[PDB]
Ligand binder design. Structure first.
Ligand SMILES: CCCCCCCCCCCCCCCCCC(=O)OC[C@H](COP(=O)([O-])OCC(O)COP(=O)([O-])OC[C@@H](COC(=O)CCCCCCCCCCCCCCCCC)OC(=O)CCCCCCCCCCCCCCCCC)OC(=O)CCCCCCCCCCCCCCCCC
Ligand SMILES: CCCCCCCCCCCCCCCC(=O)OC[C@H](COP(=O)([O-])OCC[N+](C)(C)C)OC(=O)CCCCCCCCCCCCCCC
Ligand SMILES: CCCCCCCCCCCCCCCC(=O)OC[C@H](COP(=O)([O-])OCC[N+](C)(C)C)OC(=O)CCCCCCCCCCCCCCC
Ligand SMILES: CCCCCCCCCCCCCCCC(=O)OC[C@H](COP(=O)(O)OCCN)OC(=O)CCCCCCCCCCCCCCC
Ligand SMILES: CCCCCCCCCCCCCCCC(=O)OC[C@H](COP(=O)(O)OCCN)OC(=O)CCCCCCCCCCCCCCC
Ligand SMILES: CCCCCCCCCCCCCCCC(=O)OC[C@H](COP(=O)(O)OCCN)OC(=O)CCCCCCCCCCCCCCC
Ligand SMILES: CCCCCCCCCCCCCCCC(=O)OC[C@H](COP(=O)(O)OCCN)OC(=O)CCCCCCCCCCCCCCC
Ligand code: HEM
Ligand code: HEM
Lengths: 431, 48, 126, 62, 76, 110, 110, 57, 126
């Protein structure tokens, strides 16, 4: 029900949900913010904001379209959502203003205004968006001196020396046809889509993007940007997790769903099936925490990201959740496994099926770029319910028992004890 | 009269203790390898 | 040390069967007025140990008037035990006003904590 | 200098960041220290409570 | 299909522990028992009753513990 | 219960040092009480005679046992003093009880 | 919170020898206090195991010291540990005091 | 072949301290007998067994 | 233990006199360069003992940029003495930038405290 066909160049991937309204056609490239050097960084976000600029969006809005884009750590996407009877308009707009000539987009008035707005919103993100910036510093210190370490939005110091030559070089080096996947979600049928991509000739280039010299290797590290102006203490620690197209991927997502996510002020998240919430609820050790499991192309992370207003008992929160992490290897039960199985099925269903047909476009483009064909919601559910407690114990002994962690913090984090205690509290002496 | 047993136990004790001293120097440098090689970067903050 | 649900279960079974009731409640009334916690001006539910979590929540859920009357009865019992006297005959707690006021809060608090304890030791059928 | 660009550590690092090899090396060193200290602690405790046994004149007049 | 209830039942516990705790702990706890017996095995090697009873019945480490003094050279 | 267990530990140590002090004066009740107590302490099946001739320092109650008992009769009260400090700490972190069972946090006195 | 921070004796042991925040740049001269504590425990232990044999008369003091030196098992070890650990105790104490009056830790807050 | 060594020796702490204690056993015994054999062979002819065999022959 | 107005009056009397300045300022420069606090990346106004109340008020009255730079210089001194090295030749504090940034604040704080203790022991006409 998620059909994929390889044409002369590009790969077309689509899914036809005939009850949805807005059909959404776009192209998803396989060169995100980890396919460049740290000096031209932020050229992916700059390309996204060039595509989303006032000129391009007014041209798209006069015809009845609505642009979208999403830059991630290996795929970047350009989505033109539209009405269901109007997608040949979407296709030839995306041809005429992104795939062929872009001289209307890349002259030094629109590029100057776009670069100024990008500089303002990146520095506003760096000052006033605290949990995302420490997840970003966690990525920057986990995979350091190695191309997965890069900021997605780009840093300010490597964004004020970018001109149109950088964007044209990136569009020549990474906006290819053996690197691109065109996607269709919403209610377009498959064959009218490829009929309209093969009627009007649509091909970006012919070549191949440059392969990287250094693969993503985890380096157990530590960083702290302690700003004691801030009222909270945002820390986040994470180990090396399993990447995409790895056999231990769904057990990593299940082991994240075992500990779940929490919010101390909602009275329905204080009653979950976590054993950690009987330790962190008598002195109110944190405000929220969420156990992520990110899986990029070469490697990935596995850890929790919190926020703490009780900045004196930070080490107790760290120690309690790390003992709960060691409970995965030594004595995890089966009722936690089945609770996390049902909750992981619910979360993947809420992610894969939703009202917006551009998130499905981004997910379908990513997992057709890296894998080759999309596995359905049924096969994912079968691979989830085929997981026993011993597979979780084997994976937790593989990737969580005494492994190197990487910590990224900000705020009032002097109460955070320093590194060797946190590293050697990942392994207890069997109680 | 304790000469033979004293020098023998001394040989045992200083062999064990000097090997323990070298191993403890190694484990001290291991436990402090995360502190001897930390780096501080200070860019000046913007005024309010 | 003993849960109040168990005390309430054994007491209900003793009470609402008429053979054991007319044999057990007169010696219970004689044991209560021989105990002598009413001569100090105290109801019984002040005497219970307040250092469990169940009793602490059952006290923090108490209404605002009964809490103040409870604090006054405890302080007055402290003072008339300090001077090694008893309260006079006017200020004795009568048997009709020895009503269990803390016991519904104790029962529902221990029922909630008990249900938490057996919800997190649950097993699906495997 | 950006706050995402880490300073160099390439002199204090190793070329092969194997988990099992480096962890086994560190734990073999701390285990060798624990082994020598275990034998030493046993011998000094049995020295201290071998002092409290029967002195040689009592064993002579046994 | 449609599941109208939850068909599940409590485990065997005493509040602090349960059977699922001891089932997952018991191999490491019998290993801890073996390590504790090994610890006092090495801590009581100088005890002569355990020395001549057990610590020479060891096959090849046996003759290293005894040292063959002739009986006409000891004071007692 | 921390206070009660530390008190029981002080009770054990106090029985021990009163026994050692009664056995260092060396009368007729002293020596014979010491040898009867340790002779029933030699009832352990495997290590009984070994530990009782380690405790005697010889083969019956004699000069090494009396020197040993005087050294221990000093030494155990200065463990009792530190255990009394621990008793006072374990009391002070929860307050004394009162002869009613009801709580004392309402009306207190310095 | 943690049990090493909740329990009253373990909170003291924690706050003194586990997570007591020491300054980041102290060198090997600040270990002389730990050395003095270890050597004080050494002096006390060997002193007790010598005072189990030492008799303190005027006819038996030197004779009892040379009885410790010659007849009790590993008594030469105990007497030389006491008589040399006293000298090492005073040398590490002199290093402790000289560090204290060189680095200015007699100054205004201590 | 290092993952198998780490798994069977240093993964759980019980087998770690059991290996440490068994190594302490065999190390203490062979170290004691080796150092006394070296100390009694560095002094040949000066010990009582050598003097006894000398005055017995 | 010695108030900074005393050191200030002695030093200003030494500096403003001609025959003492050019005979005591070179040996002071050589003494400061021989002390070696600049090789750790430190001005002298970090070296001053802080456990006075005067230095506490003088450090709370510091501007919010010099306080951040002072905390960084102290932390870098701690780390580069932890490694038992020195800072490289490019990061030594040069002699042109050892300005007293704290001494006006300490002088005004000690003048305030001296005026307070002078006013508390005042004597009107008797
Ligand atoms: C002076 C030095 C003081 C050092 C204190 C220290 O190292 O504590 C840090 C550390 C603090 O851990 P934490 O942050 O509380 O973590 C608690 C978690 O549950 C995780 O903690 P855990 O479960 O890993 O630690 C529990 C620990 C607790 O062990 C005990 O309390 C009893 C140990 C006997 O259990 C054991 O140590 C089992 C090993 C027993 C050793 C057997 C061989 C030696 C015989 C002696 O505790 C230890 O590593 C235990 C060290 C050994 C106990 C001290 C023995 C002193 C005897 C004199
Ligand atoms: C009594 C005061 C005077 C005596 C005071 C003595 C000094 C103070 C007490 C020190 C006792 C040290 C006990 C250490 C407890 C412990 O946790 O040992 C574990 C260590 C390795 O632990 P780790 O380095 O954290 O690695 C664990 C991670 N894995 C490998 C599982 C992935 O494994 C080892 O350490 C190897 C075993 C070494 C055995 C310890 C030797 C010294 C024993 C002394 C025992 C004294 C306590 C007696 C109590 C009656
Ligand atoms: C004496 C042997 C050691 C002499 C010695 O090494 O002195 C040099 C150190 C210098 O002191 P420092 O702390 O290393 O300062 C230099 C740090 N830079 C700036 C380089 C980063 O100075 C020191 O290390 C301080 C050691 C002084 C105290 C130890 C000597 C004690 C000897 C016995 C003194 C008896 C005093 C009796 C008092 C009643
Ligand atoms: C104010 C000052 C007052 C005095 C302060 C105290 C001074 C103490 C001085 C004496 C040092 C005690 C050493 C205890 C070691 C310990 O207990 O080892 C606790 C650590 C916990 O390590 P970890 O799990 O965090 O990481 C480790 C990686 N996971 O296990 C170890 O590494 C085991 C190392 C071998 C232990 C035996 C070493 C010899 C000890 C006996 C001799 C002691 C003398
Ligand atoms: C606090 C309580 C302890 C205080 C005393 C110990 C600390 C100071 C030790 C200084 C060295 C003198 C050794 C005296 C004992 C002896 O004679 O050691 C002899 C033994 C070998 O002799 P053996 O086995 O052949 O014979 C034993 C019967 N005579 O050497 C050792 O195994 C090494 C001893 C040093 C290692 C100590 C490790 C930590 C112990 C903490 C307790
Ligand atoms: C770090 C530990 C701190 C705690 C220390 C206490 C624990 C000690 C455990 C046992 C150590 C080895 C004992 C054998 C060594 C020996 O007894 O020596 C061997 C002696 C004979 O020797 P010999 O004349 O032939 O020797 C000549 C050359 N030295 O036989 C005896 O004395 C028999 C009596 C046994 C005495 C020890 C019994 C236990 C005493 C109490 C210990 C407390 C236990 C507490 C348990 C909770
Ligand atoms: C027997 C083994 C049982 C292990 C159970 C366990 O693992 O103990 C885990 C606990 C912590 O548990 P928690 O806070 O995570 O529990 C949270 C529940 N709500 O540490 C302890 O009890 C003791 C801590 C050990 C470190 C300090 C050791 C100090 C020893 C005294 C030395 C004194 C010398 C100076 C005077
Ligand atoms: C050396 C001997 C002892 C000393 C100096 C000592 C000291 C004290 C002191 C000063 C108090 C506070 C006063 C009080 O509450 O009564 C106290 C309380 C207490 N002691 Fe002891 N004690 C000793 C032995 C014991 C023993 C043997 C036990 C019993 C096992 C014990 C159990 C208690 C208890 C339970 C309390 C609390 C009493 C209460 O608050 O109701 N003590 N102790
Ligand atoms: C503060 C720590 C101590 C110091 C510095 C110390 C120092 C000394 C010194 C220097 C001697 C003389 C040794 C010689 O003859 O050369 C001595 C003797 C002695 N000490 Fe201590 N001592 C200390 C603690 C103790 C304690 C607490 C005891 C008792 C338990 C003790 C028991 C003895 C005995 C019995 C002797 C007699 C002679 C001998 O056998 O060495 N000591 N002490």
């Amino acid at each position: 029900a998620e059909v994929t066909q390889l044409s002369n160049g590009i790969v077309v991937a689509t899914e036809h949900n005939p009850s949805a309204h807005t059909a959404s056609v776009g192209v998803v490239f396989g060169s995100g913010a980890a396919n460049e050097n740290p000096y031209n960084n932020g050229v992916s976000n700059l390309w996204k904001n060039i595509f989303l600029s006032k000129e391009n969006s007014a041209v798209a809005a006069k015809e009845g379209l609505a642009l979208s884009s999403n830059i991630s750590r290996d795929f970047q996407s350009y989505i033109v959502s539209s009405l269901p009877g109007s997608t040949d308009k979407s296709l030839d707009f995306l041809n005429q203003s992104f795939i062929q000539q872009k001289a209307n987009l890349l002259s030094s008035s629109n590029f100057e205004a776009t670069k100024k707005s990008v500089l303002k919103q990146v520095q506003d993100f760096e000052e006033n968006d605290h949990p995302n910036r420490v997840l970003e510093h966690l990525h920057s210190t986990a995979f350091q001196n190695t191309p997965l370490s890069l900021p997605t939005r780009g840093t300010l110091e490597s964004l004020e020396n970018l001109v149109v030559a950088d964007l044209e070089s990136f569009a020549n080096n990474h906006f290819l046809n053996s690197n691109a996947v065109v996607v269709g979600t919403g209610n377009i049928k498959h064959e009218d889509l490829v009929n309209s991509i093969e009627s009007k000739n649509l091909s970006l280039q012919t070549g191949t993007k440059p392969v990287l010299k250094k693969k993503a290797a985890f380096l157990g590290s530590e960083v702290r940007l302690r700003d004691d102006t801030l009222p909270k203490a945002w820390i986040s620690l994470a180990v090396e997790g399993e990447p995409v197209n790895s056999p231990n991927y769904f057990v990593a997502k299940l082991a994240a769903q075992i500990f779940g996510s929490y919010n101390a002020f909602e009275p329905a998240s204080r009653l979950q099936g976590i054993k950690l919430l009987d330790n962190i609820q008598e002195y109110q050790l944190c405000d929220n925490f969420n156990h992520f499991s990110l899986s990029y192309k070469d490697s990935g992370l596995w850890g929790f990201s919190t926020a703490t207003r009780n900045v004196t008992m930070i080490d107790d929160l760290i120690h309690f959740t790390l003992k709960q992490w060691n409970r995965l290897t030594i004595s995890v039960t089966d009722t936690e496994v089945e609770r996390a199985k049902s909750l992981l099925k619910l979360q993947l269903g809420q992610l894969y099926e939703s009202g917006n047909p551009v998130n499905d476009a981004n997910l379908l483009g990513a997992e057709v770029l890296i894998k080759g064909s999309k596995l359905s919601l049924g096969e994912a559910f079968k691979k989830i319910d085929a997981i026993t407690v011993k597979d979780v114990k084997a994976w937790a002994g593989k990737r969580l028992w005494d492994q190197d962690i990487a910590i990224a913090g900000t705020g009032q984090i002097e109460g955070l004890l320093d590194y060797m205690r946190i590293r050697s509290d990942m392994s207890m002496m069997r109680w | 009269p304790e000469h033979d047993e004293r020098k023998r136990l001394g040989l045992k004790t200083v062999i064990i203790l000097s090997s323990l001293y070298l191993l403890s120097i190694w484990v001290k440098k291991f436990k402090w390898a995360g502190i001897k090689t930390r780096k501080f970067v200070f860019n000046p903050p913007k005024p309010r | 040390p003993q849960s109040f649900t168990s005390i309430a279960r054994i007491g209900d079974y003793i009470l609402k069967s008429p053979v054991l009731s007319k044999l057990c409640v007169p010696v219970a009334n004689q044991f209560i007025n021989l105990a002598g916690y009413k001569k100090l001006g105290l109801k019984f539910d002040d005497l219970i140990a307040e250092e469990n979590p169940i009793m602490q929540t059952a006290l923090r859920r108490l209404p605002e008037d009964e809490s103040y009357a409870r604090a006054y009865r405890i302080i007055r019992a402290h003072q008339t035990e300090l001077t090694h006297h008893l309260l006079p005959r006017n200020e004795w707690i009568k048997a009709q006003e020895d009503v269990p006021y803390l016991l519904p809060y104790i029962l529902e608090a221990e029922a909630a904590a008990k249900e938490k304890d057996e919800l997190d030791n649950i097993e699906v059928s495997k | 200098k950006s706050t995402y660009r880490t300073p160099n550590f390439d002199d204090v690092l190793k070329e092969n960041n194997d988990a099992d090899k480096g962890r086994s090396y560190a734990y073999f060193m701390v285990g060798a220290m624990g082994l020598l200290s275990s034998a030493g602690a046993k011998s000094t405790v049995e020295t201290f409570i071998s002092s409290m046994t029967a002195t040689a004149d009592v064993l002579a007049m046994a | 299909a449609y599941t109208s209830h939850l068909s599940s039942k409590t485990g065997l516990h005493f509040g602090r522990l349960s059977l699922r705790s001891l089932t997952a702990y018991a191999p490491n706890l019998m290993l801890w028992g073996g390590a504790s017996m090994l610890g006092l095995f090495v801590f009581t090697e100088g005890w002569p009753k355990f020395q001549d009873t057990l610590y020479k019945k060891i096959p090849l480490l046996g003759p290293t513990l005894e040292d063959h003094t002739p009986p006409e050279d000891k004071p007692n | 219960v921390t206070l009660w267990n530390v008190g029981v530990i002080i009770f054990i140590l106090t029985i021990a040092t009163a026994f050692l002090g009664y056995c260092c004066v060396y009368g007729q009740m002293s020596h014979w009480g010491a040898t009867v107590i340790t002779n029933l302490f030699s009832a352990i099946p495997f290590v009984g005679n070994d530990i009782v001739s380690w405790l005697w320092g010889g083969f019956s109650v004699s000069n090494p046992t009396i020197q040993r008992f005087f050294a221990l009769h000093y030494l155990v009260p200065f463990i009792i003093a530190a255990m009394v400090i621990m008793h006072l700490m374990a009391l002070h972190i929860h307050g004394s009880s009162n002869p009613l069972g009801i709580t004392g946090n309402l009306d207190r006195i310095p | 919170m943690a049990f090493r921070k909740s329990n009253v004796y373990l909170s003291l042991v924690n706050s003194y020898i586990i997570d007591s925040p020491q300054p980041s740049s102290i060198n090997y001269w600040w270990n002389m206090g730990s050395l003095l504590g270890l050597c004080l425990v050494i002096q006390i232990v060997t002193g007790i195991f010598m005072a189990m044999h030492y008799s303190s008369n005027i006819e038996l003091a030197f004779s009892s010291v040379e009885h410790i030196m010659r007849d009790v098992h590993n008594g030469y070890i105990l007497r030389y540990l006491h008589a040399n650990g006293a000298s090492f105790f005073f040398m590490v104490m002199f290093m402790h005091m000289a560090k204290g009056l060189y680095y200015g830790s007699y100054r205004s807050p201590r | 072949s290092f993952s198998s060594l780490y798994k069977t020796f240093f993964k759980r702490n019980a087998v770690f301290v059991g290996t440490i204690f068994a190594g302490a056993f065999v190390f203490q015994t062979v170290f004691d007998t080796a150092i006394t054999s070296w100390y009694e062979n560095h002094n040949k002819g000066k010990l009582w067994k050598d003097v006894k065999a000398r005055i017995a022959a």
